[PDB]
Amino acid sequence: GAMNSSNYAELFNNDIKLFVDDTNVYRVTVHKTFEGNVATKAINGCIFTLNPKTGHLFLKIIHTSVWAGQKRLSQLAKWKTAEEVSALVRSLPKEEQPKQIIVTRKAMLDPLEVHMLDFPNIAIRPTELRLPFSAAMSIDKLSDVVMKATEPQMVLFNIYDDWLDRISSYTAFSRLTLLLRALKTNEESAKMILLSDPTITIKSYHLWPSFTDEQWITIESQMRDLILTEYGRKYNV
């Protein structure tokens, strides 16, 4: 069934599972033509496939050449996503293959189900959570590798850096979703919070700064302030 607040610790048990977010697969800019009509120009996108227990992120980069000569691109994007997720699962050793795949948007259910018919024992699930994974392209290193790609490419990351050395998966996921919600609601402010202090750096092999435990509590508090605020600045409260 659908994933929601009730069954939230299920994400951190020992059954392998992946989230799939297709938001950033088909990305366009909209512009005027010389005749004054409107046109789109595609830019590189990505599939965001995340193991919430381990932090392993399979970032499949979607190069604009995929769309050349195709029609109904927003529909094709869902099927391309499902094809690539299916190919990823098939590439993994049997003992690494997920038991469930949770899609962040219900329109991915039928494309993924049809692509995964060969895997009847892998459950394809929606969620009632409104997860902020679209903001993944606000993470500078992720945006950089997507925009620089000249061909289709899969890049592997750990979106938790080394956090699991000190905190549980539950806490790591909560931190991630807080950071991404912040970046989604007010990217500039969120990014200022994360980099304001020049002495805390991002290691070459990491995505986020090297905060101490104490500094993460301060950071997390600042992100919560931001989100509640913008929720005022938005709804005037």
Partner: protein, 300 residues
């Protein structure tokens, strides 16, 4: 013209023969139905006055034997049986015909309704869907489940309709996932028509039989099958033109005959709105769209 005699009518019952029906009182001197048109399958069906639960009945073709109905007080139902003694049967029918103890199949000369509803329905195919090989006629009732329903529990008592499943390996060619899911022509023309049914006449026969079991017995799995077979055609971009024209006629007469007060449970809103207004064939069912819009505009 053929006859289905009745030994007696010991319990009060509403008896249907095809699209007609009449009430028989407990122990009324009723001895059967005469003047049944030759050339068509027929269904004779029963709803007891005490227990409207379980409509049940029998599909038969009078060219295949002499059939009669007798009430079984142990099993509590009207049973069809075959009479092997042709001289005894002719004598039994003549005596009752002389005593005017039979209702006449009440067909209006102008009226092609039953033909139009059963055009492609053959007894031999019915007998493969309803497996009881020792009899020439087939029993169906409101509660029988379909083979596909049993996969999702007595197999001898099932409706073995052809399984249709749009999210299945049979329906979806590896490497054509999107193509085959959004345009079901492969599954319609290659898998089902060329492979399983062999021609469109057998496809339409099963479609018509499913509808008739849905309408006459309220059989839910039959209704599911009817809608699935419609949806498979309408969701195919490539369908032989003669098939589309024939489907429009078939569905027109089905919608025309449907009791208005049962449209709520016998018509699937999603399938019909998709078929008539969104599918590849949205513009190919003129007669059916016109009667649906004038008889059931609420559903749409």
């Amino acid at each position: 013209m053929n006859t289905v005699p009745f030994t007696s009518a010991p319990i009060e019952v509403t008896i249907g023969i095809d699209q007609y029906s009449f009430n028989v009182k407990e122990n009324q001197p009723f001895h059967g139905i005469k003047d049944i048109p030759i050339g068509h399958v027929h269904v004779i069906h029963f709803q007891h006055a005490d227990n409207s639960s379980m409509r049940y009945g029998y599909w038969f073709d009078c060219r295949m034997g002499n059939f009669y109905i007798q009430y079984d007080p142990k099993d509590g139902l009207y049973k069809m049986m075959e009479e092997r003694d042709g001289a005894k049967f002719e004598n039994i029918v003549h005596n009752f015909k002389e005593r005017q103890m039979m209702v006449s199949y009440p067909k209006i000369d102008e009226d092609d309704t039953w033909y139009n509803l059963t055009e492609f329905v053959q007894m031999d195919k019915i007998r493969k869907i309803v497996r009881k090989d020792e009899n020439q006629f087939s029993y169906v009732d409101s509660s029988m489940t379909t083979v596909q329903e049993n996969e999702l529990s007595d197999p001898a008592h099932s409706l073995n309709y052809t399984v249709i499943n749009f999210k299945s390996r049979e329906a979806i060619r590896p490497g054509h996932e999107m193509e085959d899911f959004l345009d079901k022509s492969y599954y319609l023309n290659t898998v089902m028509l060329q492979g399983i049914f062999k021609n469109s006449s057998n496809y339409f026969g099963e479609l018509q039989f499913a509808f008739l079991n849905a309408m006459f017995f309220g059989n839910y799995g039959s209704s599911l099958q009817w809608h699935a077979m419609i949806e498979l055609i309408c969701s195919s971009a490539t369908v032989p033109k003669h098939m589309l024209d024939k489907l429009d006629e078939i569905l027109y007469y089905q919608i025309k005959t449907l009791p208005e007060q049962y449209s709520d449970i016998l018509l699937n809103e999603r399938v019909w709105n998709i078929c008539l207004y969104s599918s590849f064939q949205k513009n190919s069912l003129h007669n059916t769209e016109k009667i649906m819009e004038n008889k059931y505009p609420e559903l749409l």
